[PDB]
């Protein structure tokens, strides 16, 4: 908590998105243009669970598109990964943040980690949307 | 586990800078890299990262090190490249498992994470130590 | 072994965290440093940190400490500097095989094949310093 520093989630996540289409040749990844947001946390447990994000969709969802988004309110800040994969069934969503990779169990920790809540939704591009929501600063 | 989030990225960068403050002279950085968070012992990848520098300056008489880290989906490769002497293709095995020319530190944290430490020819002129390192995801 | 690695310049850096916590009326941070891994005992080296701001404050009546690390090819050395009224210099060496009491500080020192010494401070109590060998 002393460890918490500083993040603009909007430059991590473009960031997030350009290291991880070198990495997935497949890949469609993409910022959605964002207002800029800070939050107090943890640079590379937040870089973490979007990489471990983006590679369940694709190394288990198979996506060839991914979106990921910040939307800022008065309680935080809203993260998106929406993908155009297989996606998660409704019943399956549990076992998946109990499980370390599919499984986003890394998502999950670290966003207990920042007082906040990890959770699945199914995304308009066909996938998978996961949402992390944490708490502002 | 103690394993946590570790950018290796930074570690490097920030191992880098630290260096060039024991070691007058000694022209060391980390060489444009894509981010690259895994989980592990920050002290003990650090550590490993130190040895490496101080046996490439101490016993290689390196002027020139470059880090590096290079990611994949299978997780990352870090590279210390130095302009030394080097250590002839024989002697590697001899060199792993000796405490500092030794590098049997950098061979142990490398088993801890469950990767390989080896030794290579640089670019450079003199040792490339590569530490490759299975990712989280 | 016992002897890990540490983190030595994080230790400080939550050894001040917690003693602003636990002492009231006291400016205690670390300084700007480098990072210094060295391989050691974790739980004794946080000991020995704890146990030199503990002597500033309730011996020296210090109300403001720095802690720091200076890094070199030789290993690390920390240093706690205090604004209290400091060690007598005929108390120096001494005071480090007592239990005003730094007997913990030295044992943890010579585990790690290091020293500990007494010296003034620009802040004006006591400087105490910490070498300990490097791991390369």
Redesign the interface.
Not at 42 to 45: H, R, S, V
């Given at each position: 908590s002393?460890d918490h520093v500083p993040v603009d989630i909007t430059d991590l996540l473009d960031?997030?998105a350009?290291?991880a289409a070198?990495?997935?040749p497949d890949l469609d990844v993409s910022l959605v243009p964002s207002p800029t947001c800070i939050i107090v946390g943890?640079?590379?447990?937040l870089?973490?669970a979007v990489?471990?994000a983006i590679?369940?969709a694709v190394?288990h969802g198979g996506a060839t598109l991914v979106q990921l988004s910040a939307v800022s309110s008065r309680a935080g800040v809203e993260i998106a990964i929406d993908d155009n994969g297989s996606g998660v069934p409704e019943g399956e969503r549990q076992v998946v943040f109990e499980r370390f990779?599919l499984g986003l169990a890394?998502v999950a920790q670290?966003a207990q980690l920042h007082g906040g809540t990890a959770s699945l939704e199914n995304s308009p591009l066909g996938g998978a949307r996961l949402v992390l929501r944490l708490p502002g600063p």
């Open positions: 002393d960031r997030a350009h290291d070198r990495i997935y943890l640079p590379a447990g870089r973490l990489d471990n590679a369940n190394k990779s890394l670290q």
